[PDB]
Design a protein around this ligand. Structure first.
Ligand SMILES: *[C@@H]1O[C@H](CO)[C@@H](O)[C@H](O)[C@H]1NC(C)=O
Ligand SMILES: [Cu+2]
Length: 235
């Protein structure tokens, strides 16, 4: 159970984004049905009034929370990976449009899942904005919680992988378009019952065997991190 509060651009808080530049759902419940249109941008996908301006090369930070800003972020049990995708905003998320910018599943050194590190980061994880064409984009941040993923939702709807999905409206102003955006994958559609990483037993299988769901990260992606960039208690 987790939601996005807002974003930071180069370490500067853009302010409460809920239903303003985040297409916020009503609550922090997971999406579980892989074929549902809710997989795109969660249960209340509509255009909201603002878009955050950024330039290529900026650091765009998502900030998640559980019930209130800068709380426990998400239950420790919800181990799983984090990914960020981008699509042109005009698609409204439909079609083969989502390109993956970031993936973090299990870091073998630190012996932590992406979610565990997100808690330590006070809910913050970032991507560097890529050199795509100026215009309006959706950034889709996705957490997969695996603690009931030994079952498939389609077989047993009280269990299954849990998807926490948030779409932010981002306007890219200045970019040299050195890496124009390719075609991507559809949501719903990219993940099926047989996709690696959707069904997994975290209690018996060692995390070093986990493979996160495709697609792989685009070669035009400029990186990112799970790491606190600003202190919500101050700004
Ligand atoms: C999943 O969503 C699809 C598409 O809306 C729907 O047809 C199907 O009934 C849902 N599955 C379950 C198990 O509720
Ligand atoms: Cu939860």
């Amino acid at each position: 159970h987790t939601l996005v509060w807002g974003v930071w651009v180069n370490g500067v808080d853009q302010g409460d984004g809920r239903n303003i530049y985040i297409r916020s759902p009503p609550n922090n419940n997971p999406v579980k049905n892989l074929t549902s249109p809710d997989m795109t941008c969660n249960v209340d996908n509509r255009v909201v009034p603002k878009s955050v301006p950024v330039n290529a090369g900026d650091t765009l930070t998502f900030e998640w929370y559980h019930n209130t800003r800068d709380d426990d972020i998400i239950a420790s049990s919800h181990h799983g990976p984090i990914a960020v995708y981008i699509a042109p905003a005009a698609s409204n998320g439909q079609g083969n449009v989502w390109v993956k910018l970031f993936e973090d599943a299990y870091n073998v050194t630190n012996s932590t899942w992406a979610v565990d590190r997100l808690i330590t980061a006070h809910g913050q994880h970032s991507v560097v904005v890529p050199h795509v064409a100026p215009g309006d984009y959706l950034f889709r941040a996705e957490i997969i919680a695996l603690h009931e993923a030994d079952s498939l939702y389609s077989q047993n709807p009280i269990r299954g992988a849990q998807f926490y999905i948030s779409c932010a409206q981002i306007t890219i102003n200045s970019s040299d378009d050195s890496t124009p955006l390719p075609a991507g994958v559809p949501f719903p559609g990219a993940y099926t019952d047989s996709t690696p990483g959707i069904q997994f037993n975290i209690y018996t299988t060692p995390a070093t065997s986990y493979v996160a769901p495709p697609p792989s990260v685009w070669s035009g992606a400029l990186g990112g991190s799970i790491a606190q960039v600003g202190d919500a208690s101050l700004e």
